[PDB]
Amino acid sequence: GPLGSDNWLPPGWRVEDKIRTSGATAGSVDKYYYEPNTGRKFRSRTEVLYYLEHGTSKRGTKKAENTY
């Protein structure tokens, strides 16, 4: 039966299996989440949860001006 890892992700959300690209500690497995709504993808559920919470990426800046 299904693992239930994406038991939270709806039909709209898609999950893809991706094996670790590392080598020293590689050998694991990490699934990704793709959102057809905006075509956004996530590597970990935590990232998806954060996006869903804000209801959008809302990516901005918070670094100092760093200008003379």
Swiss-Prot record:
Residue ranges annotated for the MBD domain, each copy included: 6-68
Result of knocking out the encoding gene:
Impaired nucleolar dominance. Reduced DNA methylation in some of the targets of RNA-directed DNA methylation (RdDM) and loss of DNA methylation in 180 bp centromeric repeats.
Q: What tissue specificity does the UniProt entry give?
A: Expressed in rosette leaves, buds, flowers, stems, mature seeds and roots.
> Where does this protein reside within or beyond the cell?
Nucleus; Chromosome; Nucleus, Nucleolus
Q: What is known of its domains?
A: The methyl-CpG-binding domain (MBD) functions both in binding to methylated DNA and in protein interactions.
According to the record's subunit comment, the protein's assembly and interactions are: Homodimer and heterodimer with MBD5. Interacts with DDM1 via its MBD domain. Interacts with NTF2, RPS2C, HDA6 and AGO4.
Q: Say what the protein does.
A: Transcriptional regulator that binds CpG, CpNpN and CpNpG (N is A, T, or C) islands in promoters regardless the DNA methylation status. Plays probably a role in gene silencing. May associate with histone deacetylase proteins (HDAC). Required for nucleolar dominance that consist in the silencing of rRNA genes inherited from one progenitor in genetic hybrids. Recruited to rRNA genes in a DRM2-dependent manner. Maintains gene silencing by interacting with RNA binding proteins (e.g. NTF2, RPS2C, HDA6 and AGO4) and by regulating DNA methylation status.
Q: What is this protein called?
A: Methyl-CpG-binding domain-containing protein 6
Q: Point out the gene that encodes the protein.
A: MBD6
